[PDB]
Amino acid sequence: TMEEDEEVLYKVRAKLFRFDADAKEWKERGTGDCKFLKNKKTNKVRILMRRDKTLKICANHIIAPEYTLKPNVGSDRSWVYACTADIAEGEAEAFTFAIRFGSKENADKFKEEFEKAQEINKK
């Protein structure tokens, strides 16, 4: 699986979307456990998200210090952020992601943990 070298800092159930330019619409990429994984060699924290049942990777990227969690106009329980290098589908791509949670609390806890992971990645 390539997850044995990492500690789990935060786990929360979420749905992930990617923005398509072509069609002006959000597209689901997956639903499942979103995990913050701290590499025990580098102390680098990534997001790793797997789909329910298939366990296929829908998000795999460093929680970059330069990323900013923005509100979506339609939701009080989602964040949108640009990601420069996601390797879920294999080859490093830029995406505009949105991640939605079960509740406003889970969204706010996610943001708190994501800033904590940004501070760990700055060192």
Add this chain to the structure above:
Amino acid sequence: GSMEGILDFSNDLDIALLDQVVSTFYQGEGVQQKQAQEILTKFQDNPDAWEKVDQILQFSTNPQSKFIALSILDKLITRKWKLLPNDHRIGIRNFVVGMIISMCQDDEVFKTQKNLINKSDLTLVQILKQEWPQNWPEFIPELIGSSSSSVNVCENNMIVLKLLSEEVFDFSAEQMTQAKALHLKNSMSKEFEQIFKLCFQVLEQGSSSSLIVATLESLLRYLHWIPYRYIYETNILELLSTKFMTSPDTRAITLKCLTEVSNLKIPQDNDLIKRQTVLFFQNTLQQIATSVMPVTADLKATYANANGNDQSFLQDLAMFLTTYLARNRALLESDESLRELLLNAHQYLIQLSKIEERELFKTTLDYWHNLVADLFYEPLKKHIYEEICSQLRLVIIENMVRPEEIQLYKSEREVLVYLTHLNVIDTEEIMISKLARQIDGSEWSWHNINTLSWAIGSISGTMSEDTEKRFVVTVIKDLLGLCEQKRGKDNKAVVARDIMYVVGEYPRFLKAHWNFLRTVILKLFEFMHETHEGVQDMACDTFIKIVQKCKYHFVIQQPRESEPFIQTIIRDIQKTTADLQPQQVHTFYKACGIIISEERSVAERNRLLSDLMQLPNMAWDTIVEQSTANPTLLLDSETVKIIANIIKTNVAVCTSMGADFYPQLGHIYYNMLQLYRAVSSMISTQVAAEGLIATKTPKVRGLRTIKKEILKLVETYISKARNLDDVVKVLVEPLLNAVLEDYMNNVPDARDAEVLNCMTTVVEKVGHMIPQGVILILQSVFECTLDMINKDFTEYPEHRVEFYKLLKVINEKSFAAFLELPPAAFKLFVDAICWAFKHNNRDVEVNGLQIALDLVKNIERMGNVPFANEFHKNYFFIFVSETFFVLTDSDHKSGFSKQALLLMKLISLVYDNKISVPLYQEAEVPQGTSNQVYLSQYLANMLSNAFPHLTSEQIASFLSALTKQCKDLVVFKGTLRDFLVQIKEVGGDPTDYLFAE
């Protein structure tokens, strides 16, 4: 690209180019594969492509190319065959027969090209459907003759006969006229004696297993229609049940044959036939026990290991045993020499019932349901099956599913209830011993304690009250001990849930024992403070389930109590519900509403309803003060959630109290309709400032939720109201004032389809008493909603559905509202009905056809007056042609029955002379001419333009049959389906429309 060259027909066909395109399609990838695909599609769809088929079959070396060529031929044979001169039909027939015989004579091709041979055979069968036997009387004799010349040809001839039998008997209902299907069935029936002789010879003469399998495959098809004597008066039953069960190549197909033998129509009063029915079963089970597996075999393990075809074989055995025993077990029950056979067959079913395979379990469970229902009612049978029933009790208890899986739980419960009636002591011993295995830890697991709890719950009501009392006490005691034993709230919560589940399924025990019932409710109140996931949900679900069954016990003063327990529940409601999520609080208030509805003294019921609604009413009063003082306070997202949850609490109590809820609705009604208006202002205001995107914001979805819950509250009350005079005098005028203009004057994206749903309930319940109200509803919602939904089939799906539900009830209850429409608006009503017909959304289509039917009936009721005569002149032919459009275009098959009914009603109006004026305009036909004669002419002309490949004879015969059959819906429907077959081909026989059973 180079491939597009095959599409240029001005040049001769480059076969080698076709073979490359076909290879690129089947064997290529991505972009190249997609282009070949588009090219092959256009080649195949070229109406002259069939001319190239003979060339491709002779000179192509790509089997896939020839397969595609035979599809092109099939499209010609099934659609345009009768255009061809007789010499060309015999040409095509001869090259297809020649290619089949040629491929069968070459051993290598016969072995490796099975795809192309089977496709060729299917192509031949399409020719037989056109030509045989009227233009090919010797087909069957020649096929039989050609069969003795070669094992390969004989085997392939069995494939042709199987496909012919499928096409004529299994798949004809849909694809052929009644007259053509009867002709082909009688033709096959007349020549069957010869076909059977050949099949029986092959089966006796044996040797080639591939030939034997193909012969049994054709027999399986023959068994759908042939008379019983071909099976019972020949040696074939012995061969199927002995020889063909021993070899594994033939065993799969033979078991399927013997299952269809078990379904033959057979004389009931004949002892020889009975003995033959017994003997073939005896033989089959003996061959199973000696060649495959004994009665003791672990089929659960075999099926799980899934070696070779074992899974298919075990499925087919379950199908054979269940089919045979459901019909024939009474043949085995009286004769003591047949007892071992009857119980062996059932022991195999017990073993099949342990297999971990949902769909197989369901198949066996339907048989067990049949059996244990028979043992419940049939005298002297239960004692035969005692040991079978004992094993089945364990199988059903170990497989019980949650009641959420409604069909499977229902079936399992019914079997377990019958088995409990047959031996209650055995059922109890198994359940108590399975419980002991949870406590000692040997079978302990969350799934196992849940399964056992569902099983214990399923049999509530089957024991005597005394036996039930001792059993229920023993089970709760054991689960309490089990709960205390376990460590970690994960395990404790699972057992607590199961205690809650069981107690909720035993209301008779609770009703007899007030102290216990009180303790249970107080314990559920304790669990409403546990945040461990699932516990609060289950405490609330269990509370309302116990209240539904035991409510009377909450509303009376129990001896040794100061007050009815409902007063105690209401007093403490703030404290009880403090840690629940909003939807759990709403279930709690719904449950209290069920109890309060038991109180039939008006004054005491109203006082309870008042006390129950105290906390929401005080939150409401404080919000109305602030909200009326300052409209800005409503912008706060926290205030919007409080308001929605008050309204939702009112909806929940009104759901359970219905008519009794009126005094509470009276307390809030006028301020609630002022809040609806204020919230509407804020949504309008926000869409103006922020654009359509505002409708997606949490703030606006929060405000819309208040509007939707208000409409839901009013809809809920009015749907259950008893005093309709107060609905009309107090509720309706203010409701229409608050909602109708607000709906009409909002942009489409801000209109709530719930307004339409609420208005539907208002017209349903009191439409007759508010004729001016119905007019106002139509003026407000009709043109603006129609303009939202008449651009495409997809936009505003909720508005679409609720719109045709509203027109349907207005057309039933207040048809006068449509008489008060100006002509232009009545025209938009007809347009809207016809628009509904063309929908694929089945909710809309079905309402569309019903409104049209009810509208015609409303017009017929008016008798002979200007409005009815003008309706027919303006709209009769619009409804006739619109109904024919959706019948014939093949995109509206779901509505066939209601299209037929509407068309029959329209044809019947003219055939009876129930229309008073000429349907034709002056100087268009001789002035004396009856509407019957003009309807004939208009339809013949309309069908001729829409279907120009039909003859005048076909169309006139169809219309003749149709008008004669317009009082007989099932026969009329048959005539319509005959027409739908004939429009798909050229040269349909016009005498088909004379078909009489």
Add this chain to the structure above:
Amino acid sequence: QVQFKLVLVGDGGTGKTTFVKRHLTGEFEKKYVATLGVEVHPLVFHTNRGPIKFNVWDTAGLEKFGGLRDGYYIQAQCAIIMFDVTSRVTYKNVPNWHRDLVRVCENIPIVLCGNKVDIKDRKVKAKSIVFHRKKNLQYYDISAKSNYNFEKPFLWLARKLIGDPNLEFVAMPAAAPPEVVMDPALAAQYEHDLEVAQTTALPDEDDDL
């Protein structure tokens, strides 16, 4: 690589393309764009016995867009027949799809799938669905929209095609993702695309997730 041709057949609008797309990209397509003939897509699952690839031939259900019809079934190693539990006609046509399919593919594992079980008003009730029994088809209730049993058809087929009853889907390996860099030249560009995405509403804001 280890690959199997899978044909997906059934009436128009039953969810064939939507189900496949959900498996390829994770997305739920709400719009109905009728398939023209066939759409071919490779689909890979990671199992405890290594990767399995399905060459998925997603065929047209509408007669008018049927293209090559049974020509799509040649050399299929497995199949899914799809109907819509909200549409009775789609279950009535299951024996027609099964007939056309087995005449070309005589000995293949086939799953029968009743899609759209997420919809409240179900028209094809559990008790009516028995066609699979005598034809030895696996049957699953599915929803491409809720993902109810959405892995089950492929898990069953993979167990049949590999001949391992205990085959499981497993977590695909997850490589360490690369470092951020980021470009001052694309800075203004990122702001633009983020602006449009923030102001377009996420779909289905009433769902549990």
